[PDB]
Amino acid sequence: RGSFVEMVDNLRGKSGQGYYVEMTVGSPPQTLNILVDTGSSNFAVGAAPHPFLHRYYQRQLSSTYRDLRKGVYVPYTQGKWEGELGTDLVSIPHGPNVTVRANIAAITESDKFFINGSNWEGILGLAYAEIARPDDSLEPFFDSLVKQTHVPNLFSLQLCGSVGGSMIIGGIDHSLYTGSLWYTPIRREWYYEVIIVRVEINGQDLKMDCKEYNYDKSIVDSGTTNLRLPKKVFEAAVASIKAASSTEFPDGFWLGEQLVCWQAGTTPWNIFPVISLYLMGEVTNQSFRITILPQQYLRPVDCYKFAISQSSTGTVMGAVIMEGFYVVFDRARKRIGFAVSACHVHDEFRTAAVEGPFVTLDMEDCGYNI
Numbered sequence: 001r002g003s004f005v006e007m008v009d010n011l012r013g014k015s016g017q018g019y020y021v022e023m024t025v026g027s028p029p030q031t032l033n034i035l036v037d038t039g040s041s042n043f044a045v046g047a048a049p050h051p052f053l054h055r056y057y058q059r060q061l062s063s064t065y066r067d068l069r070k071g072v073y074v075p076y077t078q079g080k081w082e083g084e085l086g087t088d089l090v091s092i093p094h095g096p097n098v099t100v101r102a103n104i105a106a107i108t109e110s111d112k113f114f115i116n117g118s119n120w121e122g123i124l125g126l127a128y129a130e131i132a133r134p135d136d137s138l139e140p141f142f143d144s145l146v147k148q149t150h151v152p153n154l155f156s157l158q159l160c161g162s163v164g165g166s167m168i169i170g171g172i173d174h175s176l177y178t179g180s181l182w183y184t185p186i187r188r189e190w191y192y193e194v195i196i197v198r199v200e201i202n203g204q205d206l207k208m209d210c211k212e213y214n215y216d217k218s219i220v221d222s223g224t225t226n227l228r229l230p231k232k233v234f235e236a237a238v239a240s241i242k243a244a245s246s247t248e249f250p251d252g253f254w255l256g257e258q259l260v261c262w263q264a265g266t267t268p269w270n271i272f273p274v275i276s277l278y279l280m281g282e283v284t285n286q287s288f289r290i291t292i293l294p295q296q297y298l299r300p301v302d303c304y305k306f307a308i309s310q311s312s313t314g315t316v317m318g319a320v321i322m323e324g325f326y327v328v329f330d331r332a333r334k335r336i337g338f339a340v341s342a343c344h345v346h347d348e349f350r351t352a353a354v355e356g357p358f359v360t361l362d363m364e365d366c367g368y369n370i
């Protein structure tokens with residue numbers, strides 16, 4: 001229940017290119033590296049010899065493959081992916097010792113989806129059916145797993161910022177965090193949606209209507225590199241960070257329009273403030289806060305990209321946030337747990353923190369309605 005030695009360190013990645021897990025599909029098993037994404041709900045894998053791919057799903061070689069005779073098309077601002085739906089037997093070698101029949105989208109055509117030079121060939125959507133394509137009747141992988149086996153309905157992620165981490169399926173491993181876990185309610189089961197109730201730059205409040213911290217929505221997404229903030233919030237966030245760091249920078253840097261560079265080991269972390277997000281707690285009028293460092297929002301590419309950016313889809317707590325914490329996707333109890341990661345990067349002066357309880361009133365007002 002609190003120990004899963006087989007699953008520790010089962011994630012790999014490259015900075016900026018997400019985290020992937022090894023999976024097998026079909027009989028006999030075809031091994032594939034699969035992007036772990038809590039911000040989507042489709043299990044989709046390369047199914048054709050696209051030049052960027054090390055390997056791909058070869059349906060003809062699998063005796064357990066079943067055609068669903070239906071296509072799916074997933075557009076993005078940039079490009080897209082499109083594929084043919086089927087089901088096959090699925091395992092996770094460094095995961096629970098089970099095999100499940102799952103929906104799989106065999107990707108036959110894509111644009112700006114696969115990355116030139118990456119070691120992954122598909123995507124594992126870990127969120128809920130509501131945002132699955134083409135519709136909510138296509139059961140996501142994790143639902144299928146829970147329905148078909150005795151695996152408990154939760155998973156946890158330790159992302160360590162080349163890069164590594166752990167995906168514990170069906171439980172929590174207490175060696176992956178220190179201190180206590182703090183839980184925030186899943187507002188609605190589609191994305192992993194939560195509510196931010198207060199934001200502090202260097203222990204100083206932004207004094208904004210908290211309804212806008214979640215303008216549209218706030219989600220926990222392992223497929224996004226950045227901490228992403230709603231336009232109005234990003235505007236005020238930058239402004240405060242800008243004035244907090246008036247110790248030493250181009251204008252385009254703050255909009256992600258260019259990079260900023262320093263000499264090896266001369267990176268000024270201390271001229272940058274800590275950032276605290278207060279999340280809604282499990283108890284009426286009770287919240288807690290998570291605190292990340294510039295280590296998190298200044299991502300190396302010594303040249304670094306400012307890892308905070310504006311959005312029209314709301315707040316996104318991506319790898320910037322997640323790399324500081326052990327994160328528990330407690331689906332059975334409709335809540336997300338946060339604790340200090342036993343692997344997060346810090347200095348001798350400041351470390352990542354999860355603290356509570358705090359008294360916060362009108363937290364429901366922070367939740368934006370359709």
Ligand SMILES: NCCc1ccc(O)cc1
Nearest residue numbers: 037039040112113114223
């Ligand atoms: N939710 C999609 C996450 C994603 C990001 C980048 C990429 O190339 C493919 C997928």
